Design an enzyme around this catalytic site. Sequence first.
Site, PDB file in Angstrom:
ATOM      1  N   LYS A   1     176.861  97.484 116.197  1.00 28.60           N
ATOM      2  CA  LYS A   1     177.488  99.373 115.436  1.00 28.60           C
ATOM      3  C   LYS A   1     177.334 100.154 116.693  1.00 28.60           C
ATOM      4  O   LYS A   1     176.061  99.788 117.254  1.00 28.60           O
ATOM      5  CB  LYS A   1     176.447  99.238 114.194  1.00 28.60           C
ATOM      6  CG  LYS A   1     176.441 100.837 114.272  1.00 28.60           C
ATOM      7  CD  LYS A   1     175.156 100.836 113.128  1.00 28.60           C
ATOM      8  CE  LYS A   1     175.445 101.987 112.387  1.00 28.60           C
ATOM      9  NZ  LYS A   1     175.123 102.497 110.914  1.00 28.60           N
TER      10      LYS A   1
ATOM     11  N   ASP B   1     170.898 108.117 102.526  1.00 25.84           N
ATOM     12  CA  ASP B   1     172.482 107.747 101.817  1.00 25.84           C
ATOM     13  C   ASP B   1     172.693 106.985 101.075  1.00 25.84           C
ATOM     14  O   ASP B   1     173.293 105.994 101.223  1.00 25.84           O
ATOM     15  CB  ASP B   1     173.459 107.561 103.600  1.00 25.84           C
ATOM     16  CG  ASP B   1     174.532 107.977 103.350  1.00 25.84           C
ATOM     17  OD1 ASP B   1     174.716 107.907 102.322  1.00 25.84           O
ATOM     18  OD2 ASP B   1     175.255 107.564 104.544  1.00 25.84           O
TER      19      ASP B   1
HETATM   20  N1  LIG Z   1     175.431  94.351 108.987  1.00 26.88           N
HETATM   21  C1  LIG Z   1     175.816  93.671 108.306  1.00 26.88           C
HETATM   22  N2  LIG Z   1     176.908  92.765 107.723  1.00 26.88           N
HETATM   23  C2  LIG Z   1     177.709  92.780 107.016  1.00 26.88           C
HETATM   24  N3  LIG Z   1     178.003  93.108 106.887  1.00 26.88           N
HETATM   25  C3  LIG Z   1     177.962  95.402 107.746  1.00 26.88           C
HETATM   26  C4  LIG Z   1     177.104  95.349 108.528  1.00 26.88           C
HETATM   27  N4  LIG Z   1     176.844  96.568 109.242  1.00 26.88           N
HETATM   28  C5  LIG Z   1     177.758  97.471 108.417  1.00 26.88           C
HETATM   29  N5  LIG Z   1     178.440  96.531 108.068  1.00 26.88           N
HETATM   30  C6  LIG Z   1     179.680  97.094 106.923  1.00 26.88           C
HETATM   31  O1  LIG Z   1     180.123  97.803 107.583  1.00 26.88           O
HETATM   32  C7  LIG Z   1     179.937  98.886 107.651  1.00 26.88           C
HETATM   33  C8  LIG Z   1     179.673 100.242 107.802  1.00 26.88           C
HETATM   34  O2  LIG Z   1     177.751  99.921 108.098  1.00 26.88           O
HETATM   35  P1  LIG Z   1     177.209 101.183 108.114  1.00 26.88           P
HETATM   36  O3  LIG Z   1     176.164 100.537 109.146  1.00 26.88           O
HETATM   37  O4  LIG Z   1     176.833 101.631 107.298  1.00 26.88           O
HETATM   38  O5  LIG Z   1     178.328 102.299 109.537  1.00 26.88           O
HETATM   39  P2  LIG Z   1     178.048 104.139 109.279  1.00 26.88           P
HETATM   40  O6  LIG Z   1     176.987 104.656 109.861  1.00 26.88           O
HETATM   41  O7  LIG Z   1     179.853 103.994 110.153  1.00 26.88           O
HETATM   42  O8  LIG Z   1     178.571 104.148 107.958  1.00 26.88           O
HETATM   43  C9  LIG Z   1     179.295  98.760 105.987  1.00 26.88           C
HETATM   44  O9  LIG Z   1     180.017  99.495 104.592  1.00 26.88           O
HETATM   45  C10 LIG Z   1     179.455  97.429 105.622  1.00 26.88           C
HETATM   46  O10 LIG Z   1     181.598  97.136 105.630  1.00 26.88           O
HETATM   47 MG   LIG Z   2     176.943 103.277 106.024  1.00 26.16          MG
END
Ligand SMILES: Nc1ncnc2c1ncn2[C@@H]1O[C@H](COP(=O)(O)OP(=O)(O)O)[C@@H](O)[C@H]1O
Ligand SMILES: [Mg+2]
Length: 339
Positions: A123, A226
């Site tokens: 991320k 959130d």
């Molecule tokens: N550890 C993970 N495993 C599977 N999917 C993930 C994971 N982390 C994020 N995602 C996918 O990425 C999307 C965005 O992740 P998130 O941490 O919410 O980022 P943002 O801060 O941009 O909202 C999630 O809705 C999901 O689809």
């Molecule tokens: Mg998110």
Amino acid sequence: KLDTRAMRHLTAEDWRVLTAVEMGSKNHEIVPTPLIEKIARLRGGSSGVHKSIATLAKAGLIARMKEAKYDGYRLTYGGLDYLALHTHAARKDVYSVGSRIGVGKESDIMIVADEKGKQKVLKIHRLGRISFRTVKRDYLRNRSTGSWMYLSRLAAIKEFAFMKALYEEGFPVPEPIAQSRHTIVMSLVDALPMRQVSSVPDPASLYADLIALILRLAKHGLIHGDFNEFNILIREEKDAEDPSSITLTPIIIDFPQMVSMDHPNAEMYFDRDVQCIKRFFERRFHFVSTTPGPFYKDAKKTVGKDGAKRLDAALEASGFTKKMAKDLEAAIREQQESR
Ligand SMILES: Nc1ncnc2c1ncn2[C@@H]1O[C@H](COP(=O)(O)OP(=O)(O)O)[C@@H](O)[C@H]1O
Ligand SMILES: [Mg+2]
């Protein structure tokens, strides 16, 4: 987006010079050419850092800045990305990067793999990012580049600390694996966002599970901030006895905005999480709980009663100043306020 094509063209002292620009931008945003040289000194002994500078500039990892007195280079966002990846590579957390990158409003999600071939998520925090539509993909210029980079660093550090605390307490969150600068490497969860869940025959059970999560978080001193159908992943499992029935297991992600139950606005943040869940369950499954609340004043009585470890102190551990927290929360509140 982020291209990692150049990543392999880069030599050992291309990295050293890139790293030197990073270190020299600790104080000021423009790093004068002779200060890159000094910091980059191997033994040393530049000895051809001037060439690396052009390579890095050409590849857009640094950018020339001419000013009244300050004539040098600054790190770009791409440069920081590369530095983060290099660190993950060197520590052997990341071996390869997937072709699939999810470009979000506040972060980029990449799939990576390690040497053993295990897939994980990278991320990348993108505070400040804004897109422009032509009236007939950028960063908001009320802050400098270094400020946005600093804020995204804080976001990643915060989220990682919370993911560790939550993971160790037994919460259903991804396993945190490593953290560098504005980035986190974490396990890939075999679950998809609740937003796209195709069929829930029993909304009331899932609703009760999500509510228990908000209350469990609050008992440990936390409010997600959130908590909605994008930050809740649903693991689906066919039951051993009959495969028609699917058990649904929620997993929570996305923690740079978490706040303590002691936050001056905690009641607003609590109530907002609960109302997000109710709203979703009302529009998506036409489900409405007969159970009033839960209400913040109830929840607050429960922290941290019984064994409940206060997870909202995980931030103290890092070197997170009160100033760093205010800086981050201000940047975050600004992001979500203008969605
Ligand atoms: N550890 C993970 N495993 C599977 N999917 C993930 C994971 N982390 C994020 N995602 C996918 O990425 C999307 C965005 O992740 P998130 O941490 O919410 O980022 P943002 O801060 O941009 O909202 C999630 O809705 C999901 O689809
Ligand atoms: Mg998110």
